Design a protein around this ligand. Sequence first.
Ligand SMILES: *Cc1c(COP(=O)(O)O)cnc(C)c1O
Ligand SMILES: *Cc1c(COP(=O)(O)O)cnc(C)c1O
Ligand SMILES: NC(=O)c1ccc(-n2ccnc2)cc1
Ligand SMILES: NC(=O)c1ccc(-n2ccnc2)cc1
Ligand SMILES: [Mg+2]
Lengths: 429, 428
Amino acid sequence: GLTPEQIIAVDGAHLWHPYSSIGREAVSPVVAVAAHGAWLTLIRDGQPIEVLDAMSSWWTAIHGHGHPALDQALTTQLRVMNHVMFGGLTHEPAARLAKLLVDITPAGLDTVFFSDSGSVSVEVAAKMALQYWRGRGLPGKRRLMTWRGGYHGDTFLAMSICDPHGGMHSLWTDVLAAQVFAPQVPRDYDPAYSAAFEAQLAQHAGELAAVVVEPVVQGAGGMRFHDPRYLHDLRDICRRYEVLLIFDEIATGFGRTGALFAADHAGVSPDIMCVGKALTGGYLSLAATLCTADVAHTISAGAAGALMHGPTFMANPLACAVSVASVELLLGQDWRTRITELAAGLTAGLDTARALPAVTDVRVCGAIGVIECDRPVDLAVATPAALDRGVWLRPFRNLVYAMPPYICTPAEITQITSAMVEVARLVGS
Amino acid sequence: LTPEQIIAVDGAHLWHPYSSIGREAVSPVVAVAAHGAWLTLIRDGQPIEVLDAMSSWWTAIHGHGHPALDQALTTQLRVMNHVMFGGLTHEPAARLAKLLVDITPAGLDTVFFSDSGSVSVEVAAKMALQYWRGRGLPGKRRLMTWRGGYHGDTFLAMSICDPHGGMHSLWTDVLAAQVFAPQVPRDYDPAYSAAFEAQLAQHAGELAAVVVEPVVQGAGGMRFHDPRYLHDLRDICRRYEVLLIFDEIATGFGRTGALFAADHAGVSPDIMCVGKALTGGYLSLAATLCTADVAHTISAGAAGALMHGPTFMANPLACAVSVASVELLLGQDWRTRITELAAGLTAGLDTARALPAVTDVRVCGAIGVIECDRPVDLAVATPAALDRGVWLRPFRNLVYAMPPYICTPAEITQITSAMVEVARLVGS
Ligand SMILES: *Cc1c(COP(=O)(O)O)cnc(C)c1O
Ligand SMILES: *Cc1c(COP(=O)(O)O)cnc(C)c1O
Ligand SMILES: NC(=O)c1ccc(-n2ccnc2)cc1
Ligand SMILES: NC(=O)c1ccc(-n2ccnc2)cc1
Ligand SMILES: [Mg+2]
């Protein structure tokens, strides 16, 4: 047992945080001591205060924390089977979840590879793509193509298709695989962008295993939105030039952008798909990589005869069980109307931010609200400003944004947006 | 779902480790329960109890459904399932970090939590690369290892896997080109270390780190080597200014008879990875530890930070059960437990040495191995072990076990008896 002060002491000495230092943090992390529904209990000046989890804990907590149905699913599975190895054994949570995911994902994604994080699921997607073309007798097709502004995770192959600036590739000279980057995909649909992307792809087609993109929304690379019709064009380009299409839906999946999956906005299916973050409703790490029967059969028929990947905790019963509950909970309600209301709430509440001196854009897509500023947002100022108003917000770069739990009431959304609106005001000092 | 329905869904839709879709020689066996050292599996439509001789791929050190670990999970579930580690910290992460810093080899002062072993290896490599960039030596960017190793399945991890065992022939022009020393021998041979140093000497200016599994190499072949080699590696790495990384994802938390396999040599690496048994086999979790000097150098470098951050970094539920698992291990006489387990394996596997198809029998802590003279046919071996009440999963030419620490002497003998009969059948 440790007090908040003791936690801070241990943390500062011994704990790495995401993209952080040891010993050079400008501000200490804030101690979290509970989470329930849409609210975190955090320690501020020795006192526990409840604040809205406007970030959904990095996109994960779509049903809120400690949802009784999700809690119950975990405890139920715990009493029967915590985990067995997936080498040579199978089980009901894996079967149930696989059945669900093949049913609700874009058409044609018939096989499911479970892994333990988004970054791994992306490396598995790349491995599927490369083994596929090797199974077609085309080992030269081994490079990846993407558009700038993207984020696909933190492992070294995942890093190679991250935005070169966002991903700090200048720090990684001579270390990463050299991939093919198209320019930043624009917000508004412009057929010339797609025509250009096609011409670039065409000259590399004999080298390319796959195009890998985030559909409709680019998350960690800048919270940018693009017209779904671009995805339609990619599916077409990939089809005609024989390059696989991979959609990374680790941030966009399970309703977040107003469709069940963001691909559904465009009405197209990728050859391979990754899901992750919200898969377990934010309870546990789990990810999945889906692919078509053709991809699966070609890999399996190749000289290698198998997909050469197998995580230790592949298809963990506990994580699978809570995911099944989380997916069913989403599907068992009018989620489409819920997200529409949230999007309306976000738009209404963020509207006055457009007139602010430091704001360059306000944009909303489903349960995603963004205020883009003209300068970097000072965390040392923004974080306590939002906490003062009962909201946990984590800006990055020039972005004040939120992806709130789907269970947030209108009053809660009013609270979140007011805090966001106030944070941007302080930005414009 | 019924077992038959599970099998039908599984065949149509589920990938398994290193498997095909639609071309599996045998269906997987449906598991419907696990308690203690025992799995309940469906065989010919009927449930059977069998020993989890594999500890579910080396994870279940305390067995399944242990009341202390079950309750740690449900206690944490009541308070806080998870919060983002960006900007927040919490009690389970601090408790686990404190524990890990205290029990790992001396000097490992900082802890980076991630969700799997492969990722923890990638994080280790990132630490080493950012370290040398922080020292103004970005040329130090390659890795050196010895053959026979396994470090995970993500693409940097694959680059230090044994080139034959990791099927590098099938990844031509795709993987980072690393430096490989020959297979480390079982017995200590000064000439091997001398040659290792000579090879490293030729590449020192471009090497960020030596990365090895200490004492036991797992998935690459269940090979044991003399701990004195680790002493030599530490020495070589210090003199040539190359970081030393130990991958203890399979060897950690008592499995080789010491708390960490490094302890067999008294050696501290600069960076260390742990996983598989960290949560007692409940949930995916892994950790990468590094020294204060590595942490400070990265932190004072151009990036000013380690450029990595998993979504579920330091997940409160996984951390909470890991705290419980580690405390449960430390709070008992685990050294005597593993010694007794090793003696049981040694005694039980002895008659295998005489079998016509057996080339070696070897035991290291709670690891017992029969090495055969041919690849073991799973279609024969799995049901032969199930017929004797044991879940055994051979790979390559190896019939082996890494049993839960809670196995009784009678259960260990039941496991070794099954292993012997499997080895007998291999020679048939
Ligand atoms: C968060 C994210 C990832 C990586 O997931 P981790 O679980 O943090 O490794 C990959 N791709 C996208 C689009 C993401 O948003
Ligand atoms: C199992 C293992 C890994 C990989 O861990 P995953 O959790 O399967 O990614 C890495 N290194 C060693 C030594 C292992 O035994
Ligand atoms: N590297 C391997 O060949 C391997 C094999 C089996 C597994 N595995 C994981 C869970 N069950 C089997 C993991 C890795
Ligand atoms: N879990 C987190 O809170 C977190 C924060 C930042 C990131 N991040 C930042 C840049 N790239 C990833 C990832 C995870
Ligand atoms: Mg409240």
